[PDB]
């Protein structure tokens, strides 16, 4: 469920991030080992981004 | 406050 919301940007430094813009939603977000990072779908693709960049949907 | 990424690992 839980998909997010951008609220400032970021882009990816490691190949498994995501480069994300404000306003966008991330898709099937889901918690991960790593603190203060979650996974999710964007423009077709799955990847790692900053927690605390955005905010949940609901 | 700008948010920053928390490093990796």
Do not use: S
Request: proline share 7%; net charge negative.
């Amino acid at each position: 469920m839980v998909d997010y919301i951008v609220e400032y940007d970021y882009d990816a430094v490691h190949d498994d991030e995501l480069t994300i813009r404000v306003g966008e939603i991330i898709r099937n977000v889901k918690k991960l080992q790593e603190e203060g990072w979650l996974e999710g779908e964007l423009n077709g693709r799955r990847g790692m981004f900053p927690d605390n960049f955005v905010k949940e949907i609901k | 406050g700008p948010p920053l990424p928390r490093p990796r690992v």
